[PDB]
Design a binder for this molecule. Structure first.
Ligand SMILES: Cc1cc2nc3c(=O)[nH]c(=O)nc-3n(C[C@H](O)[C@H](O)[C@H](O)COP(=O)(O)OP(=O)(O)OC[C@H]3O[C@@H](n4cnc5c(N)ncnc54)[C@H](O)[C@@H]3O)c2cc1CS
Ligand SMILES: Cc1cc2nc3c(=O)[nH]c(=O)nc-3n(C[C@H](O)[C@H](O)[C@H](O)COP(=O)(O)OP(=O)(O)OC[C@H]3O[C@@H](n4cnc5c(N)ncnc54)[C@H](O)[C@@H]3O)c2cc1CS
Ligand SMILES: Cc1cc2nc3c(=O)[nH]c(=O)nc-3n(C[C@H](O)[C@H](O)[C@H](O)COP(=O)(O)OP(=O)(O)OC[C@H]3O[C@@H](n4cnc5c(N)ncnc54)[C@H](O)[C@@H]3O)c2cc1CS
Ligand SMILES: CCCCCCCCCCCCO[C@@H]1O[C@H](CO)[C@@H](O[C@H]2O[C@H](CO)[C@@H](O)[C@H](O)[C@H]2O)[C@H](O)[C@H]1O
Ligand SMILES: CCCCCCCCCCCCO[C@@H]1O[C@H](CO)[C@@H](O[C@H]2O[C@H](CO)[C@@H](O)[C@H](O)[C@H]2O)[C@H](O)[C@H]1O
Ligand SMILES: CCCCCCCCCCCCO[C@@H]1O[C@H](CO)[C@@H](O[C@H]2O[C@H](CO)[C@@H](O)[C@H](O)[C@H]2O)[C@H](O)[C@H]1O
Ligand SMILES: CCCCCCCCCCC1=C(C)C(=O)C(OC)=C(OC)C1=O
Ligand SMILES: CCCCCCCCCCC1=C(C)C(=O)C(OC)=C(OC)C1=O
Ligand SMILES: CCCCCCCCCCC1=C(C)C(=O)C(OC)=C(OC)C1=O
Lengths: 429, 429, 429
């Protein structure tokens, strides 16, 4: 009767726990999370826009997880002793494991001076709801809006979505002509996304912004967010300011102190993210796996202003699939190990229409991309929200038909047999 | 029995006078203009191309204006005394006013050395007719053509139209492959138009010029026009030259001496254009209004080579509606004041097809834009020409149906209630 | 009967010889070529891909040319004595002529250090076959690919074709995700082609490279190709390095030693190409004509990294028609002389689809361009290949219907009466 502990009750943690449970009924699974609910992160921009109720995009874990025989501990994990195979919670409870899955998501870094106090963010439900309050303040007395991403950001999509959604909302309110909008990014160009673009995404987003009168500044470092302005620095070292009554900036991500508490063989010395190989397994502690945003994946491109690689939902579901198979196979002494494909279907909701991006794989060189836009993509976004929430509530994040459908439509194979796990995650084995 | 004097028998003056007349049949209205005719400015490029007869795009005003009980004086206004509420003509007639509307249009400044003598222009009917004479010389003895805008230009559209029309003509004459064409502009890029661009106008005009082999140089200052060359200076201060048998350049605009004659409270000290507020009313002398190109509107953006804001026909028409309502409301002891929306439908005629640009408002931030191209837009431009000419001859520049049609097709409302006129024209109340 | 010697058994030489034969049945015509076959050059990229067999895109000349009363000498022409009106072959045979047509094609210069040794090329059948052999090694052991053009290149299309064909092949083999691809060119931008672009060719090729994940570097000078990497220099003089396991670079072109042997009135000092006027006749020796790539045509523009003008198939067929008429008219004491239009239909085959480019003329000012892309263009490329080879085998490179069909579809007339032959080739009479 083996014991896996999963740290984090989000996309990566839930998917891995559910996968493990469905692969191995005879396996003990403990999920530890500091939030009592699963939060559907792709709906956080909508929540900030006041287009969702929190209750409709979240799932209480305590009455749910026991239905699938998973023990839920609603506590923050404080430290990991990888030599002892132990996790210690904030309350001091020490829980021993045979396998550990770290899926804590991003630790948010508000790197611009004054950002956390003066700006808004949409990365958590709590921050999103705070943003909504500030937006109601904006509608009552319109002023300049600045949205974007600071240096080191690795999740750019929600910023683009939020900007376009806000444009949509101001337009519906008839006050868009009273609200200047500017997008400022650390990406070397619009639609880079920390992935070197997806097809002609640069041309697509530039045209989208031109059509919707969203001014933009790319390839710069946002250095300060003041109550009245945003200050950014270009590559020449020249500083510029842009007026702003309302701002929404993406923080950069780093790993949590719980990961840092394990050795420098577990926590990447540069960013505290979980050191993993191609099989998303720690190179030194073979019973530790990382799933999701918390995993240390090298940037696709060293950009003039530092940027990182996104870990999207599909990428994370593929990691979860690989990790679950990797743990089960180790338990059963099956030598087969899996690397996730790390392909992605991504949809950027703009209001009534949406951008559809497919990248296979996300990390270049690519076999295939799809870049489309239309109303259909918006409805697909909403439909997938309903679908995924159902999956969380029904104990299977990987129903057999889903993989078949993705294979039928997009030739996707989520995981590959990996003959040698040694190497950076995302590198081809 | 109140008295309004309108200076200028063009788009702004005629529109304001007609609006006032339809609003207030009992009002005394005197129109002062140095030209005996209304000239339909949007057909001056066509006139230059020899595609119009002068008689077909102009309306004699002396026989016409008495039909709508408007007094017409065919004289140049020489000076304005704002403290005496008087206007003096070149002969010496002192006309007293209760309200004054200044709508003298552009005073042309041929800022490049040799520009007035060696180049051509299409800004007046007289200038356009001379350009046709010079085009015949070009067809007879083919050589290099260069067209564009000098520094400080605010009306770029007709230069693009003219270039494309001339290409069209050259090609029809079978001499295009014998005539090099170069477009040189103070705009930071093609399709800036002095408005920071309209939707994807940059991309659109670039592709247009590329498909038609029109070479271009942007973001430079034309310094001299010689009989055989055009000299321009780049941002690095370096001088360059281009061969030219025929040229056509836009002059920059300033305010007239008649506006300068009034206070520095009326004449903008930097350009002699009329100081107006959001309601197109002088801040100091509240019975003075400005309508049209003569109004001092700040640049949308300060460009590397100085560039100013166009005042297009639709913009002028909205100014005229706003100013007419503001005068009448003052007469009727009504506190309600209006600002024009300053939206624009602009059609650049290219010959057989045309570019259609809609910006609402022209001064950002914008509610929406439409950028289209096709044969239909050329037929629309010709149709509108006939329509507007008819409106001039029939005494109503703003028939009720037109506002309703614009509303249902483009979501345009021409004027808005302004709670606080205090501010720059085009800035939001 | 008079005697014409044609040096070169390629597109230009065959076209001129056949044009002369059909114009003048009694004319004695001798063709001298070092290759025993006509090679269909536009199928050489396909030969390099292994998509053609050599015998399917070549025609043995010795048994063919006598059927058209053309004497074939399968020898390299070694020298030309223009004063004695003689050509000497490598074996020392002296051939006297009344008129001489020089059509020896490009002499290849592998200007980058280690290029001929470490890279591949597709400019001859023999080189393309070596490339095919090295490609097999890339599929077996996938790694970084870099393709492009060194400084002074004048034929860029085949590099674009080969890059996109290789992408197609790798995607066919399902190994494109293992092969980084980078395009490096002397062109100031993508789709310049040594002609200053064709319509929106830059925008088209950029979007295409983006859609297919082909990275690119333009406006640089490739200095060295090592087994390990490509070294290039930017315009600041800074050297850069890009990793490469397989490369394919275009060489630059010069003229041959046989041309150099005729002295500096015939051989251009800078490149050893044939000095010709508008009528493709040598200015000094009026009985010497040049046809094809070997002709000295000035560049369309001096680019920051030097590039030259392509001589495409259609341009060369037009040169051939003009030269044949010019020779025949001299014989018959007809003072009419012709210049080629020098327009170009260019199809860049990308595998399963293709880019269609049409420029009329290629050298600006242009009457028109067409830039299109689709599957249809690939099928036309294949169809044209079959059609041209048929024409070689059947003794008519200029069937009357082809000129009519080109007139109907593209409004092209291949040659024009030239009232003054004196001037640069491509300059307007
Ligand atoms: C705003 C936003 C939008 C967004 N939209 C996306 C989209 O439309 N498509 C898509 O594919 N991806 C989108 N993403 C990215 C990504 O899918 C999300 O960031 C995921 O949520 C990432 O999943 P993870 O499992 O990596 O992280 P998580 O946040 O869902 O879950 C972490 C859980 O861990 C808990 N926790 C943190 N620290 C803990 C400690 N010390 N101890 C116990 N538990 C801990 C935490 O409470 C949570 O339950 C989008 C991304 C964004 C965000 S900026
Ligand atoms: C060449 C050209 C083309 C052009 N095309 C346009 C278009 O296709 N669409 C569009 O929307 N706008 C276009 N414009 C711009 C604008 O619509 C025109 O410039 C208007 O003509 C501007 O209207 P205004 O009322 O501002 O000026 P006006 O020139 O029409 O009339 C001024 C009248 O005043 C007289 N006048 C001058 N000075 C006087 C004194 N001192 N005293 C008495 N009267 C005076 C003058 O004679 C005239 O009747 C386009 C613009 C252009 C031009 S560059
Ligand atoms: C790889 C490649 C592709 C290519 N594709 C083209 C295309 O798709 N469309 C198009 O319009 N043009 C394409 N071109 C360019 C051009 O059409 C070709 O280069 C032509 O082959 C040029 O014709 P030429 O007659 O100029 O040259 P040639 O190579 O066909 O023939 C020369 C003949 O002369 C012989 N020869 C050389 N030296 C000699 C001496 N000293 N004595 C006697 N004979 C000599 C030689 O053997 C040959 O028979 C494309 C171009 C390319 C290539 S990079
Ligand atoms: C159950 C299946 C779930 C698996 C997900 C499959 C992913 C595959 C998505 C890639 C294919 C895109 O899918 C399709 O793209 C086209 C091209 O823009 C869209 O666009 C099409 O329909 C719209 C609306 O009727 C038209 O205005 C448009 O002219 C037409 O091109 C379609 O509405 C969309 O259905
Ligand atoms: C009744 C008077 C009109 C009031 C002015 C209203 C202006 C209309 C602006 C609305 C924007 C829609 O603009 C619309 O776009 C389409 C899309 O290319 C245009 O073009 C379309 O119709 C034309 C008809 O000749 C077709 O030949 C063409 O193939 C097609 O693309 C329409 O001609 C244009 O009307
Ligand atoms: C019979 C021999 C005649 C050929 C002579 C050579 C001259 C060639 C002249 C080229 C004329 C223009 O080329 C023409 O472009 C259009 C694009 O709108 C192509 O049309 C293509 O694209 C459209 C839109 O994606 C598709 O729906 C269509 O099925 C496809 O064929 C035509 O297939 C092509 O023939
Ligand atoms: C018959 C019911 C059809 C539902 C099955 C198809 C669901 C597959 C959705 C793919 C997808 C995944 C996995 C995914 O992770 C993701 O990111 C959040 C998407 O973007 C919205 C996706 O579209
Ligand atoms: C069905 C009846 C037909 C209604 C006709 C309404 C036409 C309204 C014209 C709008 C317009 C204005 C005001 C206008 O100023 C302008 O620029 C000069 C246009 O472009 C040519 C316009 O299209
Ligand atoms: C019945 C229809 C008759 C079709 C006649 C064939 C048209 C001739 C092809 C034109 C052409 C020429 C001359 C040509 O030289 C060329 O470059 C190699 C092309 O690109 C593929 C061409 O398309």
């Amino acid at each position: 009767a083996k014991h896996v502990v999963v740290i984090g009750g989000g996309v990566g943690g839930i998917a891995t726990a559910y996968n493990l449970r469905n692969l191995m009924p005879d396996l003990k699974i403990t999920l530890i999370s500091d939030r009592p609910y699963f939060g559907f992160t792709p709906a956080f921009p909508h929540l900030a826009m006041g287009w969702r109720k929190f209750e409709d995009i979240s799932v209480p874990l305590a009455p749910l997880l026991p239905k699938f025989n998973i023990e839920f501990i609603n506590e923050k994990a404080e430290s990991i002793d990888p030599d002892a195979n132990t996790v210690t919670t904030q309350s001091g409870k020490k829980i021993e494991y045979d396998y550990l899955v770290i899926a804590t998501g991003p630790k948010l870094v508000f790197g611009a001076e004054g950002q956390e106090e003066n700006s808004t963010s949409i990365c958590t439900a709590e921050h999103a709801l705070e943003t909504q309050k500030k937006l109601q303040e904006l509608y009552a007395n319109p002023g300049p809006v600045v949205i974007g991403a600071i240096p080191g950001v690795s999740c750019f999509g929600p910023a683009y979505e939020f900007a376009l959604m806000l444009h949509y909302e101001l337009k519906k309110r008839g006050i868009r002509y009273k609200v200047p909008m500017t997008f400022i990014t650390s990406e070397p160009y619009l639609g880079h996304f920390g992935v070197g673009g997806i097809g002609a995404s640069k041309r697509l987003v530039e045209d989208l912004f031109a059509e919707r009168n969203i001014d933009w500044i790319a390839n710069v470092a946002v250095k300060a967010i003041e109550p009245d302005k945003v200050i950014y620095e270009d590559l020449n070292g020249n500083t510029h300011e842009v007026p702003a009554k309302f701002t929404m900036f993406m923080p950069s991500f780093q790993g949590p102190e719980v990961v840092a508490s394990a050795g420098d063989k577990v926590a990447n010395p540069a960013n505290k993210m979980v050191i993993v190989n191609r099989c998303f397994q720690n190179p030194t502690y073979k019973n530790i796996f990382g799933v999701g945003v918390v995993t240390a994946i090298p940037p696709i491109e060293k950009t003039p202003i530092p940027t990182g690689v996104p870990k999207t939902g599909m990428m994370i579901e593929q990691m979860a699939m690989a990790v679950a198979h990797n743990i089960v196979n180790d338990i059963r002494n099956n030598p087969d190990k899996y690397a996730p494909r790390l392909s992605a279907i991504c949809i950027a909701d703009f209001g009534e229409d949406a951008g559809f991006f497919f990248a296979d794989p996300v990390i270049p060189p690519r076999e295939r991309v799809i870049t489309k836009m239309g109303k259909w993509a918006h409805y697909f976004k909403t439909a997938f929200e309903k679908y995924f929430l159902w999956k969380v509530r029904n104990g299977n994040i990987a129903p057999s038909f889903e993989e078949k459908v993705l294979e039928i439509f997009l030739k996707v194979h989520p995981i590959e047999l990996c003959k040698d796990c040694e190497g950076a995650p995302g590198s081809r084995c």
